[PDB]
Amino acid sequence: MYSDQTYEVIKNRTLENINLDIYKGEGSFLNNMVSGNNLELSKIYLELSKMHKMAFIQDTYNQFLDKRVNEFGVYRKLGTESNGEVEFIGEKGTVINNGTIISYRDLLFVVIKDVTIGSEEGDNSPVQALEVGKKYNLPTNCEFKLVDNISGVTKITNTRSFEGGTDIETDEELKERFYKIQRNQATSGNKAHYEEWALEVDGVYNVKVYPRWDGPGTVKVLIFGKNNQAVDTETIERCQQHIDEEKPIGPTITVVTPLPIEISISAVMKLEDGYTLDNVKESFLESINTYFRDIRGEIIYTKVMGILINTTGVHDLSNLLINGSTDNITINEDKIPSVTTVNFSE
Amino acid sequence: MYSDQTYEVIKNRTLENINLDIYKGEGSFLNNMVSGNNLELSKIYLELSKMHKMAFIQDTYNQFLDKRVNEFGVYRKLGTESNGEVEFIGEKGTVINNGTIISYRDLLFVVIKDVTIGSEEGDNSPVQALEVGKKYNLPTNCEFKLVDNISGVTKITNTRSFEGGTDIETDEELKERFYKIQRNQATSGNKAHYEEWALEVDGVYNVKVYPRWDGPGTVKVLIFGKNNQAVDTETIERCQQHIDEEKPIGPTITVVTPLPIEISISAVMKLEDGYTLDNVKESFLESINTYFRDIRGEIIYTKVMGILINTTGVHDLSNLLINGSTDNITINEDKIPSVTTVNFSE
Amino acid sequence: MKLIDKLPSFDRNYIVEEIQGAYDTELNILKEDIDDTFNQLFVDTATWGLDMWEDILCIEKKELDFDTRRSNIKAKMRSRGTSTIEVIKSICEAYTKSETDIKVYSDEFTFVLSFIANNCDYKTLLDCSDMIERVKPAHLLHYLEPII
Numbered sequence: 001m002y003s004d005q006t007y008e009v010i011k012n013r014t015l016e017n018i019n020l021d022i023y024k025g026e027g028s029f030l031n032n033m034v035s036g037n038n039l040e041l042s043k044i045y046l047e048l049s050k051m052h053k054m055a056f057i058q059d060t061y062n063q064f065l066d067k068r069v070n071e072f073g074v075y076r077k078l079g080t081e082s083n084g085e086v087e088f089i090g091e092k093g094t095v096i097n098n099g100t101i102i103s104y105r106d107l108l109f110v111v112i113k114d115v116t117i118g119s120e121e122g123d124n125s126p127v128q129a130l131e132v133g134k135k136y137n138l139p140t141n142c143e144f145k146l147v148d149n150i151s152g153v154t155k156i157t158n159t160r161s162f163e164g165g166t167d168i169e170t171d172e173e174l175k176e177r178f179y180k181i182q183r184n185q186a187t188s189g190n191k192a193h194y195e196e197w198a199l200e201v202d203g204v205y206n207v208k209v210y211p212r213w214d215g216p217g218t219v220k221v222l223i224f225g226k227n228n229q230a231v232d233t234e235t236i237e238r239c240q241q242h243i244d245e246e247k248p249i250g251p252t253i254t255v256v257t258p259l260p261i262e263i264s265i266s267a268v269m270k271l272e273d274g275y276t277l278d279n280v281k282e283s284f285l286e287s288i289n290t291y292f293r294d295i296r297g298e299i300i301y302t303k304v305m306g307i308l309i310n311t312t313g314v315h316d317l318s319n320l321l322i323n324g325s326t327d328n329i330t331i332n333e334d335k336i337p338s339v340t341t342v343n344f345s346e
Numbered sequence: 347m348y349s350d351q352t353y354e355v356i357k358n359r360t361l362e363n364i365n366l367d368i369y370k371g372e373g374s375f376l377n378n379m380v381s382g383n384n385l386e387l388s389k390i391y392l393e394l395s396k397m398h399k400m401a402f403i404q405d406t407y408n409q410f411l412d413k414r415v416n417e418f419g420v421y422r423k424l425g426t427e428s429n430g431e432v433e434f435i436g437e438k439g440t441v442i443n444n445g446t447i448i449s450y451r452d453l454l455f456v457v458i459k460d461v462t463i464g465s466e467e468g469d470n471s472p473v474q475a476l477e478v479g480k481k482y483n484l485p486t487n488c489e490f491k492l493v494d495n496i497s498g499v500t501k502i503t504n505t506r507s508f509e510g511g512t513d514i515e516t517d518e519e520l521k522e523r524f525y526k527i528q529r530n531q532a533t534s535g536n537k538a539h540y541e542e543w544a545l546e547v548d549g550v551y552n553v554k555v556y557p558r559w560d561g562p563g564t565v566k567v568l569i570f571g572k573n574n575q576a577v578d579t580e581t582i583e584r585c586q587q588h589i590d591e592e593k594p595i596g597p598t599i600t601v602v603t604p605l606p607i608e609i610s611i612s613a614v615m616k617l618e619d620g621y622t623l624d625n626v627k628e629s630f631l632e633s634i635n636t637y638f639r640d641i642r643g644e645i646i647y648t649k650v651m652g653i654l655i656n657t658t659g660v661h662d663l664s665n666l667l668i669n670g671s672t673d674n675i676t677i678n679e680d681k682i683p684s685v686t687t688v689n690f691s692e
Numbered sequence: 693m694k695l696i697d698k699l700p701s702f703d704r705n706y707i708v709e710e711i712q713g714a715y716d717t718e719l720n721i722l723k724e725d726i727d728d729t730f731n732q733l734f735v736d737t738a739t740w741g742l743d744m745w746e747d748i749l750c751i752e753k754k755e756l757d758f759d760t761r762r763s764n765i766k767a768k769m770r771s772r773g774t775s776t777i778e779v780i781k782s783i784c785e786a787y788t789k790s791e792t793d794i795k796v797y798s799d800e801f802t803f804v805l806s807f808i809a810n811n812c813d814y815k816t817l818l819d820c821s822d823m824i825e826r827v828k829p830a831h832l833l834h835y836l837e838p839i840i
Contacts (some may be wrong), residue, residue, distance in 0.1 A: 010386060013380045013386070014386055016380065016382075016383075017382030017385050017386070018375065018378045018379045018381070018382040019378050020378050020379070021375060022374035022375055029381055030375070030376075033377065033379070033383075034382075036382055037386070038386075041386060044390065045390075048393070048394070048496040051397075052397075056413060057414075057416075057417050110687055126350065179416075182416075182417070182418065182419030183419055183421070185419070185534070186531070186537075187534050187539075187592055187593075187594065187596035188534045188591075188593075189535065189536025189594025189595045189596065190591075190592060190593075190594065191595065192594075193534075209593045209595075212595075212596075216562075216596045217563065219595065248534065249535065
């Protein structure tokens with residue numbers, strides 16, 4: 001191909017193309033024109049080889065990828081600026097106006113709202129990164145410094161880690177994203193397609209779909225908030241409207257929120273020395289709350305009493321009763337145990 | 347414009363651009379070098395035109411075609427290998443380890459399950475084809491040979507035919523898929539979308555969709571292989587389960603394949619000199635097979651018996667009956683003619 | 693201009709220069725041809741190439757201006773019909789020039805279109821219904837109802 005086509009090869013080819021009495025000689029004037037044209041033609045061959053690659057969907061550049069995705073209607077992500085809140089410590093009554101820039105090392109951060117040291121609202125003010133990037137996502141407790149000294153301001157530190165700083169999307173990321181988009185398109189009523197739109201709601205984390213719950217075409221949408229806790233009613237409403245904005249033709253949609261199950265417990269236990277009823281009560285309730293957060297399936301009475309005895313301050317235990325029974329209690333779907341009654345006696 | 351400039355026009359233009367008192371004489375070495383440089387110029391312009399062609403892929407299938415098709419989300423389906431089970435016959439107690447190499451004719455196969463002859467597990471072990479293609483879809487009772495010499499083994503044969511060997515994709519087939527998609531307009535939950543879904547699975551070449559065949563939420567899907575041929579039930583199952591993966595939930599999917607129409611031939615004909623019954627029977631079988639490949643609508647008695655009289659070795663014929671009659675029979679949908687009985691005599 | 697620079701000292705006279713200048717002008721023509729072809733490679737920069745772009749798209753029509761060619765190409769690819777009922781309902785209302793309500797039973801899979809018969813005529817109603825069935829899911833059954 002064009003790699004085979006070179007200065008020497010095309011030069012000899014052109015020399016053969018000419019039927020002339022002049023013997024071919026190095027440095028001849030006619031040889032000079034032929035050699036110059038062949039050099040520029042070889043350069044043009046290299047350019048053609050390059051525009052092979054530049055015309056492809058892959059191995060594009062910033063402008064090339066931009067044009068391709070604009071033809072596809074896709075747009076690359078420039079990233080987002082980091083956002084956090086810092087604390088200003090210094091002379092009381094000092095007013096830090098909006099637009100003030102605080103520098104941590106070489107990083108530059110700007111204060112959004114006015115903050116007064118010693119004010120009733122406090123000395124905490126949200127601070128946004130001047131530019132996008134992971135480097136702007138500063139951790140907690142960073143000693144920010146004013147670029148411009150302000151009288152009355154001494155120490156600037158963030159009580160929370162800076163977040164929201166996202167980097168510039170790379171070409172490969174956008175290429176793979178576009179390839180996935182073309183590969184997987186929105187369908188009418190696929191479980192994954194419908195569930196993804198529900199996943200866009202911030203409040204909910206886990207989404208489940210129960211089709212045929214009320215006959216053909218009937219879809220029962222099941223949602224789960226933070227660690228499968230029930231979200232607020234307004235969150236349910238906004239999720240319902242959102243999924244209706246993307247729902248297929250003629251579906252019946254019901255959003256189901258997780259339910260809590262109250263738990264009442266009672267036992268007659270012996271407490272270890274130096275420990276009171278309140279301490280063992282709080283420790284065991286925290287432990288059993290963790291267990292409820294991790295319990296899969298139904299309740300295990302033996303596991304409950306095991307976490308009870310393993311709790312510090314339990315000399316011995318007896319007469320353990322949960323919800324009026326000592327048997328294993330079945331947990332149904334969308335039901336999470338909730339600690340409500342703790343009847344502990346020594 | 348690459349096509350705008352041609353060899354002789356630019357040759358004359360270059361000659362005119364030379365402004366010298368030297369007369370421009372034909373046959374001169376100067377004219378000869380202009381001719382050679384213009385020859386290289388025509389080569390580079392033609393190559394630029396070919397570059398434009400390769401960029402548009404109006405003809406001359408290229409890698410550009412594959413990449414542009416991948417841009418539109420369509421991707422080549424490589425295919426699958428044939429599957430089956432073989433019987434090991436030989437000395438009792440011999441163990442045929444997994445991965446054993448067996449060759450029947452040119453094709454090569456691999457043992458999938460470690461089988462011991464004489465064990466309670468039986469002498470039958472699954473075998474999968476080592477390459478993608480329909481040739482590996484071996485029929486039943488085929489004998490297989492050990493590539494490696496194993497003591498105590500005598501015969502290897504398959505109790506059933508081998509299936510699952512979908513053919514490898516061809517560039518023309520992908521081009522036709524892309525073009526028919528270009529006329530199509532897939533929509534989330536659409537009949538054309540369902541047709542595309544069916545076309546996705548290998549072995550599916552012709553797709554028929556029937557909406558409301560039974561009414562409310564009822565889907566009737568009819569598929570065809572190459573040249574409107576029936577497909578294996580495994581392919582049907584794969585296609586229907588894939589559709590169910592992508593289909594909206596609630597519709598009733600129904601996928602079927604064409605079935606043959608049996609035909610029996612009875613006739614008395616005068617054998618030609620130097621021709622036997624088997625030869626003319628085989629020749630007419632080939633003729634009727636290619637005619638059935640080319641047939642559409644109904645079988646025409648006159649056409650069949652006229653292609654019989656035109657067959658080599660056929661002098662005169664009489665009392666020709668198709669299924670005992672001389673009447674044209676309609677070839678319905680998802681139905682193809684099938685030759686069952688051939689009765690020729692003198 | 694480049695060749696004469698590459699040319700030797702003894703070839704600095706006009707007799708040598710004329711051929712090199714003519715060839716340099718020709719190669720300038722060739723390089724602007726390369727530029728034009730590279731523009732033709734990209735669909736946005738390609739003006740005359742938009743026709744066989746549409747031919748690749750397998751849609752053919754006489755066209756006025758290249759901007760509309762690019763717009764039609766962008767519309768042709770992607771632009772998937774939404775599964776939302778509202779978009780299709782709006783299109784149906786635009787065809788019929790009358791509002792349409794939906795009484796859909798997922799158990800029945802039944803779709804119904806109600807519209808004033810006076811607003812929309814027979815032929816355009818049939819065309820709109822054919823377009824709907826082209827877009828509407830095959831399993832779902834739709835019905836157009838004219839209001840007397």
